Amino acid sequence: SVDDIKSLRLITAIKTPYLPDGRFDLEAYDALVNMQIVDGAEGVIVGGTTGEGQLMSWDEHIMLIGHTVNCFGGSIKVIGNTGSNSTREAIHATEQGFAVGMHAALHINPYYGKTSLEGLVSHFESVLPMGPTVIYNVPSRTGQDIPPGVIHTVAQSANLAGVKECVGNDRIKQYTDNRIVVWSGNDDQCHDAKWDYGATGVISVTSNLIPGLMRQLLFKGKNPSLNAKIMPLVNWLFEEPNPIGLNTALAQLGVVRPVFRLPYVPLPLAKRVEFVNIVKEIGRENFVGEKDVKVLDDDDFILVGRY
């Protein structure tokens, strides 16, 4: 059960698509999950950073984790992002998530409302007993680097599957040398993480677009060449904060509606044209969907604040 998570090499942090009024577009979401499955993704993160979980009510969130489990749980591992900057919120979400059948939880350290190292331990130890758990470190978002010390302290739990690491390949290695399963959370770094730094795989953004190529990158030996060729795409996705790019790109491919929940807004026209070129360089047949890529007009995009 923890071992079943520990073996996953490709996890997609799935985007969450919306209807024109802001509510979840379940029909679109299901088609994305399907496409991920068809191309070899072994797990999904539901409502991750990429999934705009930060923009969900707990409501929506648990419902989505549950829908995903009920429709797709036999085919793919479901990792609910039930983390919080608040311990109470995390305990309660995690327990509801596991109750609706999720396979694991993703847990970030408390963002914004930063705690002490002792506090991190208390926080993690309060949810770790609930099930298989992946700890999320991303200091550029949270304002706090989880030190390896904390990680080893909590790794005394049998329920810890591993870390989602964003600090770099060098940290990934501090961990993988010391009996700790790591997935890279940086797409631009993940090839080398896997083949040179001991990472088990990726929890990927880029997977939402090119799941087959992402799997290729991780399953079949070193391939710096394939790595180099997807890199222009990766750079585009991260120019602005994720998931601004992915949301824009999924709309251009026609697999989601051009609807954004604020505070996210689409990439400008110049970027979108650029996307079309990036797509043709790589080959459209490698991206999700069947439809011809569009540039889209600014007026196509809907921004929702009240939903």
What residues are annotated to the active site?
136, 164
By CB under 6 A, name the one of 34, 75, 86, 153 that touches ligand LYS. 86
Nearer to ligand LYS, 66 or 201 (CB): 66
Beta pairing partners, 81: 106
87 binds ligand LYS, rule: CB under 6 A? no
Phi-psi region of 223 (alpha: psi -120 to 50; beta: other; left: phi over 0): beta
Would you call 30 helix, strand, or coil by DSSP? helix
Rounded distance, CA 139 to CA 160, Å? Answer: 20
Read off the tokens for 67.
């829908």
Least Cβ distance, residue 51 to ligand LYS (angstroms): 9
Is 53 among the residues that bind ligand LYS (CB under 6 A)? yes
With both helix axes pointing from N to C terminus, report the angle between 58-72 and 87-99 in degrees, rounded to the nearest 10. Answer: 30
The answer to whether 204 and 246 have CB atoms below 8 angstroms apart is: no
Amino acid present at 13:
A
Which token pair is 151? 């990680």
Which residues are registered as beta bridge partners of 137? 165
What is the nearest approach in angstroms of ligand LYS to the Cβ of residue 45? 12
Rg (CA), the chain: 18
Minimum CB separation of residue 96 from ligand LYS in Å reads: 11
Amino acid at 124: F
- Is residue 54 close enough to count as binding its own copies by CB under 8 A? yes
In this structure, are strands 259-261 and 160-165 parallel, antiparallel, or unpaired?
unpaired
84 binds ligand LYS (CB under 6 A): yes
306 touches which of its own copies, ligand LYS, none (CB within 5 to 8 A by kind)? its own copies
Mask 182-221, x = binds its own copies (CB under 8 A)? ----------------------------------------
Partner touching 58 among its own copies, ligand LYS, none, CB below 5 to 8 Å by kind: ligand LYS
CA distance 144 to 110: 8
Q: Assess contact for 46 and 81: CB atoms under 8 A.
A: yes
- Kindly tell me which residue out of 9, 15, 61, 215 binds ligand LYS, with binding defined by CB under 6 A: 61
The reply to whether 137 sits near its own copies by the rule CB under 8 A is no
Residue 240's binding partner among its own copies, ligand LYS, none (Cβ under 5 to 8 angstroms by kind) is its own copies
DSSP state of 50: T
Q: Lay out the site mask for its own copies across 32-51 (x = CB under 8 A, - = otherwise).
A: -----------------x--
Sequence-distant (≥ 6) Cβ neighbours of residue 187 within 8 angstroms: 202, 204, 205, 206, 234, 237, 238
- The residue sitting closest to ligand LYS, measured at its beta carbon, is 54
141 contacts its own copies (rule: CB under 8 A): yes
Instruction: Read off the amino acid at residue 169.
Output: N
Token pair belonging to 80:
């609910």
Q: Is 24 in the site for ligand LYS (CB under 6 A)?
A: no
Helix (H, G, I), strand (E, B) or coil at 307: coil
Give min distance, CB of 232 to its own copies, in A: 20
In the complex, the residues that contact ligand LYS under the rule CB under 6 A are 47, 53-54, 56, 58, 61, 84-86, 89, 112
In the complex, the residues that contact its own copies under the rule CB under 8 A are 49, 52, 54-55, 85-88, 91-92, 108, 110-116, 118-120, 122-123, 126, 139-143, 240-241, 244, 261-265, 303, 305-307
